[PDB]
Coordinates of N, CA and C and ligand atoms in Angstrom, one line a residue:
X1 N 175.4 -69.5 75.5 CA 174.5 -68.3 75.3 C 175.1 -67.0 75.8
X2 N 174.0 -66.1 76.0 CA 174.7 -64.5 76.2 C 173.5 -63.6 77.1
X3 N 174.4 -63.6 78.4 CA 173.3 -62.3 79.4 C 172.5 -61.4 78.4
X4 N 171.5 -61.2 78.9 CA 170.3 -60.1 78.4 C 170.2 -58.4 79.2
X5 N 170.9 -57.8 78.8 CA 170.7 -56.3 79.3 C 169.8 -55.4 78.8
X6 N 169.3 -54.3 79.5 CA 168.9 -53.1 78.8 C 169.6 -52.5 77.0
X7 N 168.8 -51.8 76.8 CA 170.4 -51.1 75.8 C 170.6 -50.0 76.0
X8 N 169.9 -49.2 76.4 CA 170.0 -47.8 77.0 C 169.2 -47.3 78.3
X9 N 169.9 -46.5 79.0 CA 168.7 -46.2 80.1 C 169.8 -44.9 79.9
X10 N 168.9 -43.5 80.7 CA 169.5 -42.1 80.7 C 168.3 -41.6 82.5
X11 N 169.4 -41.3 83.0 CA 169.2 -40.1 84.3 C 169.5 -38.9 84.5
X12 N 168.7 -38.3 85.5 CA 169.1 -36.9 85.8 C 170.1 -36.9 86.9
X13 N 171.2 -35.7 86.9 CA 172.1 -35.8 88.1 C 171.8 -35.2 89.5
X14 N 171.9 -36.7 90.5 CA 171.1 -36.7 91.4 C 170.5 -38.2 91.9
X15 N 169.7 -38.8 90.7 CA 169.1 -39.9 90.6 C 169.1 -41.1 91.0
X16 N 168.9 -42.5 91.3 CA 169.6 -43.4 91.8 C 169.0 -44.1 90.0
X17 N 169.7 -45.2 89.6 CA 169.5 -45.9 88.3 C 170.2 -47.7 88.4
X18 N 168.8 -47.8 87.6 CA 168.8 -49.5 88.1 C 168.7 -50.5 86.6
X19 N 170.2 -51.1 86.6 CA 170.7 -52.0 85.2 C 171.0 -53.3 85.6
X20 N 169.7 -54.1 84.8 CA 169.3 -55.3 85.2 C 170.4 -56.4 84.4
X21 N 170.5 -57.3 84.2 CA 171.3 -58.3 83.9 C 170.1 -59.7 83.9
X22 N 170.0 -60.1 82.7 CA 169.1 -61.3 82.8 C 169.9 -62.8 82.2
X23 N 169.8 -63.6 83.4 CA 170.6 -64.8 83.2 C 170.2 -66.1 83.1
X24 N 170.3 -67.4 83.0 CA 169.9 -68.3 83.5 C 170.3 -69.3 84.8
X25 N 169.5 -70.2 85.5 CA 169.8 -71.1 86.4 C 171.4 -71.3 86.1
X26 N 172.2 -71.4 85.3 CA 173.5 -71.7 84.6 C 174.1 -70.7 85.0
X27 N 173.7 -69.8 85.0 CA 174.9 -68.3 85.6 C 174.0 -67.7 86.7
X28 N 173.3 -66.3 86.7 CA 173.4 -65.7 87.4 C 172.6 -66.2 88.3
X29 N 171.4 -67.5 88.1 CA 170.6 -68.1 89.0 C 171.2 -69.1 89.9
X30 N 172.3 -69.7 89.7 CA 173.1 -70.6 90.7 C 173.9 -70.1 90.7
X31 N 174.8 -69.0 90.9 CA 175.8 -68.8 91.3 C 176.0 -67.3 91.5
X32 N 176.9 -67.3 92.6 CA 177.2 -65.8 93.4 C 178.4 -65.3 92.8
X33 N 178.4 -65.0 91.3 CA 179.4 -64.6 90.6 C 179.8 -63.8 89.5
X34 N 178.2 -62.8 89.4 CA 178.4 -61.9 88.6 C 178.9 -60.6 89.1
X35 N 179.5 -59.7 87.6 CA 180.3 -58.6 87.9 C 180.3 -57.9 87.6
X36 N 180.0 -56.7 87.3 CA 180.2 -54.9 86.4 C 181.5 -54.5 86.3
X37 N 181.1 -54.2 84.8 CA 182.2 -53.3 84.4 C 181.8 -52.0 84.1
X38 N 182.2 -51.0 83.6 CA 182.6 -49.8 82.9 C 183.7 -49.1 82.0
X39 N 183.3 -48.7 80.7 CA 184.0 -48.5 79.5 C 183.3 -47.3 79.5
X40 N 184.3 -46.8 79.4 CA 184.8 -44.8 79.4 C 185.5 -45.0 78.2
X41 N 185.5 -44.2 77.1 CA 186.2 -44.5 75.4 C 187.4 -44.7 75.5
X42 N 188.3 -44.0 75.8 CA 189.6 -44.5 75.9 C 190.0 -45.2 76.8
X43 N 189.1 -45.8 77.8 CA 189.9 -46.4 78.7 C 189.6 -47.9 79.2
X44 N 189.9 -48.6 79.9 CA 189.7 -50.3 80.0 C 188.7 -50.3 80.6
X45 N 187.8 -51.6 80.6 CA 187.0 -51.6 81.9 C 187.7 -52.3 83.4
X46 N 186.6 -51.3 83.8 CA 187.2 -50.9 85.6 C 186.0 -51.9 86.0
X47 N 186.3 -52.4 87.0 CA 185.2 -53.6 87.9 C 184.7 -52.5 89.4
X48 N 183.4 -52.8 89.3 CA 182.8 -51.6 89.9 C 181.9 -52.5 91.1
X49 N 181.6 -53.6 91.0 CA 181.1 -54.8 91.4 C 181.7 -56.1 91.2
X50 N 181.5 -56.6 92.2 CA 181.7 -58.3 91.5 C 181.3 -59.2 93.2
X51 N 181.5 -60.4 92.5 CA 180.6 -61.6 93.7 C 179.3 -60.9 94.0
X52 N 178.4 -60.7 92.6 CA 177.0 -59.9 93.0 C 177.0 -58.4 93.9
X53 N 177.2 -58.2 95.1 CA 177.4 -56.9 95.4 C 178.6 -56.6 96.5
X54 N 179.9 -57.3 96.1 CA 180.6 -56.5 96.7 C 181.6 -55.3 95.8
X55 N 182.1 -54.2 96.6 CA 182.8 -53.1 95.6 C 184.4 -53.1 96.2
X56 N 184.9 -53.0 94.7 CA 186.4 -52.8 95.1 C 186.6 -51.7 95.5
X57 N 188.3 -51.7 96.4 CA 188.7 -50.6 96.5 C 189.0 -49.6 95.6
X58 N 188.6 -48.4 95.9 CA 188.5 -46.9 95.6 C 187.5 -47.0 94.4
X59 N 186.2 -47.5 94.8 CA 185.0 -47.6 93.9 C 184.2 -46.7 94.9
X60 N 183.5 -46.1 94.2 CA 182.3 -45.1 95.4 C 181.6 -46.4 96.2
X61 N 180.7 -45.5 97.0 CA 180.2 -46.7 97.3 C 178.4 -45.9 97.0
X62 N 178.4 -45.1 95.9 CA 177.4 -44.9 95.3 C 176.7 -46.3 94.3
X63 N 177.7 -46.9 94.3 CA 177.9 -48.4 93.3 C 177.5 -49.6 94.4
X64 N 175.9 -50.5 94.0 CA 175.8 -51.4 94.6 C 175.2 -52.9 94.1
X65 N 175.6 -53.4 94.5 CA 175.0 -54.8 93.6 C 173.6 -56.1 94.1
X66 N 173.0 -56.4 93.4 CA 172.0 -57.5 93.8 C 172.2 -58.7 92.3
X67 N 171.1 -59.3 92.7 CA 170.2 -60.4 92.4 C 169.6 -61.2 93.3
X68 N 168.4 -61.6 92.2 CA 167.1 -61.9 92.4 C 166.3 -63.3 91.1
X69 N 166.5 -64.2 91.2 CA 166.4 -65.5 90.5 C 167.1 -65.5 89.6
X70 N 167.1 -65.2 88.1 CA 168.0 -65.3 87.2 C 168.1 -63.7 86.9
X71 N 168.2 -62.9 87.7 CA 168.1 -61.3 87.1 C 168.8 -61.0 88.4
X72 N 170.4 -59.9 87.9 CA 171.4 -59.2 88.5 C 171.0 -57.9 88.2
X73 N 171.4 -57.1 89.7 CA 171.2 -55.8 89.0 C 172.2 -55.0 89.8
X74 N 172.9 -53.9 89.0 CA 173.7 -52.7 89.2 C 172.9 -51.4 89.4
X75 N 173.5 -50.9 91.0 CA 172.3 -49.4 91.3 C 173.6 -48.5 91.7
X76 N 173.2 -47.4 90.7 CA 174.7 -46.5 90.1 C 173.1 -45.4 91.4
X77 N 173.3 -44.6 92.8 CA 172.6 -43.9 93.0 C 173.7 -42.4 93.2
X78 N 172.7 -41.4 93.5 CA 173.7 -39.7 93.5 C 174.3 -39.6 92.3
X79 N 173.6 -40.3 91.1 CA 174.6 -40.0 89.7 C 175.0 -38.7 89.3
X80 N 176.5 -38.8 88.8 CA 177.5 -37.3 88.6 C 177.8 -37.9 87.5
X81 N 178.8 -36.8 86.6 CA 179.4 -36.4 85.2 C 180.0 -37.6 85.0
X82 N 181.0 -38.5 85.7 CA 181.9 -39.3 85.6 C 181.0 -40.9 85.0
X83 N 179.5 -40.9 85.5 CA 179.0 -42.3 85.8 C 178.7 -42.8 84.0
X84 N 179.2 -41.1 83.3 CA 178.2 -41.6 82.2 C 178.8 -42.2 81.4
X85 N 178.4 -43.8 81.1 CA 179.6 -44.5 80.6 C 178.6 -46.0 79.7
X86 N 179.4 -47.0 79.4 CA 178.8 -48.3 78.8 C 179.1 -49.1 80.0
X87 N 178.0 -50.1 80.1 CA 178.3 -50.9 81.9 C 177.9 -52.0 81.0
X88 N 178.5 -53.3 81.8 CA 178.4 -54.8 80.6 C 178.9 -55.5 82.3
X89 N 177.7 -56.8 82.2 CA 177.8 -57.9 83.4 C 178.3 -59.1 83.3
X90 N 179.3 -59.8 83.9 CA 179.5 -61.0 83.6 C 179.6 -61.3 84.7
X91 N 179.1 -63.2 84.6 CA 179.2 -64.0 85.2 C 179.6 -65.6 85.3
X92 N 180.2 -65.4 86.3 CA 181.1 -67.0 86.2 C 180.0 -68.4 85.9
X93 N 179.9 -69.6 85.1 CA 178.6 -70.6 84.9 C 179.3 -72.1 86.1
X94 N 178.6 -72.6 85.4 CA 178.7 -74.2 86.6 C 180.1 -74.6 85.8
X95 N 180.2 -74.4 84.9 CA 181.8 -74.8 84.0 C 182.7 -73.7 85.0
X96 N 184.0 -73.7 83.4 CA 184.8 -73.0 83.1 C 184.9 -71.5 83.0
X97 N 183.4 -72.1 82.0 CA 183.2 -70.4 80.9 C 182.7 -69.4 81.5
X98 N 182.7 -68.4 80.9 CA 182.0 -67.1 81.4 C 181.0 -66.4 80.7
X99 N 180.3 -66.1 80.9 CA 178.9 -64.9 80.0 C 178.8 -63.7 79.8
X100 N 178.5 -62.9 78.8 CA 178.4 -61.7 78.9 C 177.6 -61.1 78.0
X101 N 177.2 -59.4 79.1 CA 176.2 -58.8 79.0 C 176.6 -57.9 77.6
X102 N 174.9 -57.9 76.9 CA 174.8 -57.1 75.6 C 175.2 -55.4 75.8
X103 N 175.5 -55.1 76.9 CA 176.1 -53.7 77.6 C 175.1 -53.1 77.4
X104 N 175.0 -51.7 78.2 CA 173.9 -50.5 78.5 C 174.3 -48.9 78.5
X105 N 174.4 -48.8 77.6 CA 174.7 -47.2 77.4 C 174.1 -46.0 78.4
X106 N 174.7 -46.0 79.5 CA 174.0 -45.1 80.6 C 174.5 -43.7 80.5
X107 N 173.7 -42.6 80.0 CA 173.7 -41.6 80.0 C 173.2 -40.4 80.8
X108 N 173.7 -39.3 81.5 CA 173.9 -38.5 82.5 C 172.6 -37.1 81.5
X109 N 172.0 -36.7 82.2 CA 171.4 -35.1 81.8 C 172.2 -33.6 82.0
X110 N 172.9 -33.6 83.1 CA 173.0 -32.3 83.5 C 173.6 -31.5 82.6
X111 N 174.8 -32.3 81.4 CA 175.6 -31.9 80.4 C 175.5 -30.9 79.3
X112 N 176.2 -29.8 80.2 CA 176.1 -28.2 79.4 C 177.2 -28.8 78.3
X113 N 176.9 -28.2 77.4 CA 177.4 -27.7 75.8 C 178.9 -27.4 76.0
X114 N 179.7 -27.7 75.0 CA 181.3 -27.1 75.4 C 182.2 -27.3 74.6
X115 N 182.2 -26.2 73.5 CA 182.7 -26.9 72.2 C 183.8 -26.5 72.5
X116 N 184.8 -27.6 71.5 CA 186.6 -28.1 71.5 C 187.4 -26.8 71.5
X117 N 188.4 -26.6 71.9 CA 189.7 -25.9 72.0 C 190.5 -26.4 70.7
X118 N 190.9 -26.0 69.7 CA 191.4 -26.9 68.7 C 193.2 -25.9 68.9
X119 N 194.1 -26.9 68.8 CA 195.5 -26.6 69.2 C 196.0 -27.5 67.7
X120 N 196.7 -26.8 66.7 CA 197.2 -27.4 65.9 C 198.7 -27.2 65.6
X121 N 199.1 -28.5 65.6 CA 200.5 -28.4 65.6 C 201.4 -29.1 63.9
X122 N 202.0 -27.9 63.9 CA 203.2 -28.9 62.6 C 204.2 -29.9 63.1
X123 N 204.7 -30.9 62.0 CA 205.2 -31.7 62.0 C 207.0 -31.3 62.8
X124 N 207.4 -31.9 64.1 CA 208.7 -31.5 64.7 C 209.7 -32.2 63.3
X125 N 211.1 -30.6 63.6 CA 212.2 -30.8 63.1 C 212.8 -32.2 63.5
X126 N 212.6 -32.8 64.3 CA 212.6 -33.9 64.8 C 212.2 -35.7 63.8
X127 N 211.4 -35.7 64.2 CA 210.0 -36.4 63.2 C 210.4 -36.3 61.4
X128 N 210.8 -34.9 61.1 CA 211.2 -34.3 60.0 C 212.6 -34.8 59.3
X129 N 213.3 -35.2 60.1 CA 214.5 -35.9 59.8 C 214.7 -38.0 59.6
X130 N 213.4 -37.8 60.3 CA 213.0 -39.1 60.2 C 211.8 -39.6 59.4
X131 N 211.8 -38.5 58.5 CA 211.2 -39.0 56.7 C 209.6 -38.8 56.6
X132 N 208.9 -38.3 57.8 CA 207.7 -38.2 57.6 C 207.2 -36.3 58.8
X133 N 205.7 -36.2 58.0 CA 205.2 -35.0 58.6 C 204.0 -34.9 59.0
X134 N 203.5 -35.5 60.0 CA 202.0 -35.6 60.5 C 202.0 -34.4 61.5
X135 N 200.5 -33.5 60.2 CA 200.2 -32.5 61.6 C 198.9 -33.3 62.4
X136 N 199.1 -33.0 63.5 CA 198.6 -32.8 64.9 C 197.5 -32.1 65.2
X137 N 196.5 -32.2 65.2 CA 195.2 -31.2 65.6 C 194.4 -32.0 67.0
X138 N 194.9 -31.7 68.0 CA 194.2 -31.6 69.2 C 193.1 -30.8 69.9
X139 N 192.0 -31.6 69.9 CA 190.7 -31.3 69.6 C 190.3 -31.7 71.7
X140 N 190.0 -30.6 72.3 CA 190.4 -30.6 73.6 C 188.7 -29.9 74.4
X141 N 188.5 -30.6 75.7 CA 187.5 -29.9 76.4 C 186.2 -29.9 75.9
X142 N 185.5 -31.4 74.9 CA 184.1 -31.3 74.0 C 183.3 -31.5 74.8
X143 N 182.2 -31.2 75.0 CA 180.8 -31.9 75.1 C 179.6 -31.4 74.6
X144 N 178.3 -32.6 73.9 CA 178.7 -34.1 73.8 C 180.0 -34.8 73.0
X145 N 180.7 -35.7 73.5 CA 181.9 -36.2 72.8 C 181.5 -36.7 71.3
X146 N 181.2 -35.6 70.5 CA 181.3 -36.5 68.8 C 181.5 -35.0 68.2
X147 N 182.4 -35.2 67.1 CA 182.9 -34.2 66.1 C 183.1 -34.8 64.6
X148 N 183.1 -33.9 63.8 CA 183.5 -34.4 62.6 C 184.6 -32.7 62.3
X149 N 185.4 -34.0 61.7 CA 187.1 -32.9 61.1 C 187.1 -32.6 59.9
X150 N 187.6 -32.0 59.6 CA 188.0 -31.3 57.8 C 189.4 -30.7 57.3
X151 N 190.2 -31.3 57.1 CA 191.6 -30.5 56.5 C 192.0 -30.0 55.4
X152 N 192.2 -28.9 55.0 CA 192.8 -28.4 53.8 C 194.1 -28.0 53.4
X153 N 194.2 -27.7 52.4 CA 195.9 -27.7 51.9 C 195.4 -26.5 51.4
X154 N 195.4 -25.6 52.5 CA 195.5 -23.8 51.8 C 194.0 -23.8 52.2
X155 N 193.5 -24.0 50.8 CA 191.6 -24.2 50.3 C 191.2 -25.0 50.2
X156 N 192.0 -25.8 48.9 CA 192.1 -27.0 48.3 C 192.0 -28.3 49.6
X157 N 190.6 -28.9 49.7 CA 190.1 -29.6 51.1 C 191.1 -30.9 50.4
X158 N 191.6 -31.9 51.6 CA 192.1 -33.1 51.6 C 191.2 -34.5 52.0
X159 N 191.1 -35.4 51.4 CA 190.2 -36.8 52.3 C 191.7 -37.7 52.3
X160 N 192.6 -37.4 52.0 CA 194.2 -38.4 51.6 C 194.8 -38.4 53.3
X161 N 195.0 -39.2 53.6 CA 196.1 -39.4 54.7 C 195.5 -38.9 56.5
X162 N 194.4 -38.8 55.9 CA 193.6 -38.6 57.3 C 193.3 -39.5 58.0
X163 N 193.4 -39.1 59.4 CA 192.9 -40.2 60.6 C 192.5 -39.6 62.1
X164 N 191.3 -40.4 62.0 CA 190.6 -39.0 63.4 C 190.3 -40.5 64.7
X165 N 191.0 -40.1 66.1 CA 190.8 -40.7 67.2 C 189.6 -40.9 67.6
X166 N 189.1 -42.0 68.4 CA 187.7 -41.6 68.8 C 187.9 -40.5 70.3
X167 N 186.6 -39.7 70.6 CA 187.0 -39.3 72.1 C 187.3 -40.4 72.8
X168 N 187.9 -39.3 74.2 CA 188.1 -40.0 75.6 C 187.9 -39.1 76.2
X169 N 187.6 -39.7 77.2 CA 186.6 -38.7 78.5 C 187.9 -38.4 79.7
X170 N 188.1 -37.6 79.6 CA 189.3 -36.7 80.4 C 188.8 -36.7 81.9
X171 N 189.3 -36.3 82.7 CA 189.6 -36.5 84.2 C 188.1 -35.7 84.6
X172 N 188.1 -33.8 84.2 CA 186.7 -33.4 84.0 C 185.4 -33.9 83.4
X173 N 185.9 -35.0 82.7 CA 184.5 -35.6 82.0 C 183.9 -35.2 80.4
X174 N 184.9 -34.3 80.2 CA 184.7 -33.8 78.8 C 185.9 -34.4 77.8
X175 N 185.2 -34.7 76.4 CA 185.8 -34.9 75.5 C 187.1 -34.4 74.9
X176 N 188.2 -35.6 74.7 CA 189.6 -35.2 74.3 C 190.0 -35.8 72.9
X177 N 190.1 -35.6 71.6 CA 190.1 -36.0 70.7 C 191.4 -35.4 69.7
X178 N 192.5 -36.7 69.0 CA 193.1 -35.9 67.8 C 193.1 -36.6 66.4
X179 N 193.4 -35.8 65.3 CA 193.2 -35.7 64.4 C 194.8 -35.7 63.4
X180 N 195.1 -36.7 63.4 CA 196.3 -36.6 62.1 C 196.5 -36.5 60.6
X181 N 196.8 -35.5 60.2 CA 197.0 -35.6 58.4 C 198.4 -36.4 58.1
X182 N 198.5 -37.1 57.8 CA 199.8 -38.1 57.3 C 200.8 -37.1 55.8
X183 N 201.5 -36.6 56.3 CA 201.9 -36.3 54.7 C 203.6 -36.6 54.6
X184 N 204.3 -36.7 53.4 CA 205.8 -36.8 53.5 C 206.5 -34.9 53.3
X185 N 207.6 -35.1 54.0 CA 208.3 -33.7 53.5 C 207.8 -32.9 52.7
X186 N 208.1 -33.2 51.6 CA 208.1 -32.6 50.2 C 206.8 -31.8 50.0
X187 N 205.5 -33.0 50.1 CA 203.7 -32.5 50.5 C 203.7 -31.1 51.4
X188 N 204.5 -31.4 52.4 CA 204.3 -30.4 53.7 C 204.5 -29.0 53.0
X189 N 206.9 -29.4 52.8 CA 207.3 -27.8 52.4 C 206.5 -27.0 51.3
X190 N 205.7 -27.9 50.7 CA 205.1 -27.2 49.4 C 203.7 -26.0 50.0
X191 N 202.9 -26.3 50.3 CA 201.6 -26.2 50.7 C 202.2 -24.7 51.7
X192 N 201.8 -23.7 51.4 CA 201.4 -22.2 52.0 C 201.1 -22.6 53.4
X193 N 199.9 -23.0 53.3 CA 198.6 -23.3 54.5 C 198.4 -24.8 54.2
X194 N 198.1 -24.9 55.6 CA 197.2 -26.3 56.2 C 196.0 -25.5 57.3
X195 N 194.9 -26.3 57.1 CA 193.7 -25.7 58.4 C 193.2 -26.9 59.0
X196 N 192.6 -27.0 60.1 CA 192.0 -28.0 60.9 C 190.9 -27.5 61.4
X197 N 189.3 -28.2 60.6 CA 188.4 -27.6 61.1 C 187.3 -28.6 61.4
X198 N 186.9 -28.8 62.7 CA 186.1 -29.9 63.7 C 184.6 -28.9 63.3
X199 N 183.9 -29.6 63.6 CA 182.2 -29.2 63.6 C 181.9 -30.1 64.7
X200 N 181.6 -29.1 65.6 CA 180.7 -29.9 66.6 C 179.4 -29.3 67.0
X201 N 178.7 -29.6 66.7 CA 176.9 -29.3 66.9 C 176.5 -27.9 66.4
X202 N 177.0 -27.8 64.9 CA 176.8 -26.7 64.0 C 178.1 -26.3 64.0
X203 N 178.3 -25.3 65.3 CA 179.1 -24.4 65.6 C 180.7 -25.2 64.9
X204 N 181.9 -24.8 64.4 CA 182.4 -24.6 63.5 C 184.1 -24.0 64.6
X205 N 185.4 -24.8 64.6 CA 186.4 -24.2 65.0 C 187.5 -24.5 64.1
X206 N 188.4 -23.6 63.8 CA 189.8 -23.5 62.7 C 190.8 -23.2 63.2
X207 N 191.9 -23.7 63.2 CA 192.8 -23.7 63.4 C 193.9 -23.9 62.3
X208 N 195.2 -22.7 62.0 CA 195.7 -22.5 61.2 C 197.6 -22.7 61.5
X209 N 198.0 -23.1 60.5 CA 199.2 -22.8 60.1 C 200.7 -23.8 58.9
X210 N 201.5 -22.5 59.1 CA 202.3 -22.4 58.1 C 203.8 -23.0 58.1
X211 N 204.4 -23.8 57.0 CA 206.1 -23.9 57.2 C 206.6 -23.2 57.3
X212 N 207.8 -22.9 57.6 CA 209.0 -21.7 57.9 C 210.3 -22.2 57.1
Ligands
LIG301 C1 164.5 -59.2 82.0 O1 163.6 -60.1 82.5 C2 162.6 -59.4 83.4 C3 161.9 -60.4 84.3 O2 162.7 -60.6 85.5 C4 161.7 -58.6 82.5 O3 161.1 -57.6 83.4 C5 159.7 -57.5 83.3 O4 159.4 -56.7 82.1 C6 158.0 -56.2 81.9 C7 157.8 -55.6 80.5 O5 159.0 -55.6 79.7 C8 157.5 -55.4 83.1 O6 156.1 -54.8 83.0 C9 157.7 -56.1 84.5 O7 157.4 -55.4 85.7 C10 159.2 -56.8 84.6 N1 159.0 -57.9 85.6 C11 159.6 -58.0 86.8 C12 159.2 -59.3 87.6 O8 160.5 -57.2 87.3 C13 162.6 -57.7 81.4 O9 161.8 -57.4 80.3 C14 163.9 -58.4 80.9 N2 164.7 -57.3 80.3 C15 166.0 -57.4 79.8 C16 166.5 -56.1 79.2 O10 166.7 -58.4 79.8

């Protein structure tokens, strides 16, 4: 089978916040062995609990753990910019195996507005000699982390050879995202102009440039 979680819960910064874990006699009810994680987009999950409520080193110790018959619970309290993340519980069973939680999308309020820095780069003389030309559009400083991109050849819009990163939550807590057009030589030296243009929550940023 498979732990039972919340799917979403959202706090204000400040708050204390409480994500339950529901298990059976088989996991979290006989045994002292459930654990939290956290998944930040680009990054692994970090163990923020485990053995029910002990915390690793250099974990806050805003982070604490319980259970209570077949139900574990994670209390994230004094919630800041950093906490807002996906959290998923496992637990060790009377076997081998292990169980895991349907994860909980915990979402933070305080989150001012902060659209991307868009930095676009051409393909290095470098890279250039080695038979390909992907520009570069680094999409920098978002929040909330979701964008949609747009590339053109001059005017003339592209859907060919595109590929857009998902965010990652940068050290500040705001969105870092890029954006590659795939093109060969020849595609590049031709084309006048290339643009790179992200939409994030209406508002609209371009970024421009030219071969030499
Ligand atoms: C997990 O199971 C718990 C029981 O431990 C459920 O919690 C109860 O839910 C109802 C309504 O959904 C409330 O009015 C109660 O106060 C809760 N009971 C207790 C004893 O705390 C819960 O629905 C389950 N949820 C998930 C997401 O697994």
């Amino acid at each position: 089978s498979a732990l039972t979680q919340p799917a979403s819960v959202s706090g204000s910064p400040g708050q204390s916040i409480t994500i339950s874990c529901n298990g059976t006699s088989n996991d979290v009810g006989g045994y002292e062995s459930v654990s939290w994680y956290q998944q930040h987009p680009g990054k692994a999950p970090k163990v923020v609990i485990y053995d029910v409520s002990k915390r690793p080193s250099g974990v806050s110790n805003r982070f604490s753990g319980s259970k209570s018959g077949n139900t574990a619970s994670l209390t994230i309290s004094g919630l800041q910019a950093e906490d807002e993340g996906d959290y998923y519980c496992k637990s060790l069973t009377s076997t081998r195996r292990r169980v895991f939680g349907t994860g909980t999308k915990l979402t933070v309020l305080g989150q001012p507005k902060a659209a991307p820095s868009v930095t676009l780069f051409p393909p290095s003389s470098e890279e250039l000699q080695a038979n390909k030309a992907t520009l570069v559009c680094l999409i920098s400083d978002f929040y909330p982390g979701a964008v949609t991109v747009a590339w053109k050849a001059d005017s003339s819009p592209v859907k060919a050879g595109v590929e857009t990163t998902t965010p990652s939550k940068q050290s500040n807590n705001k969105y870092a995202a890029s954006s590659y057009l795939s093109l060969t030589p020849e595609q590049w030296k031709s084309h006048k102009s290339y643009s790179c243009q992200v939409t994030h929550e209406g508002s609209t940023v371009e970024k421009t440039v030219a071969p030499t």
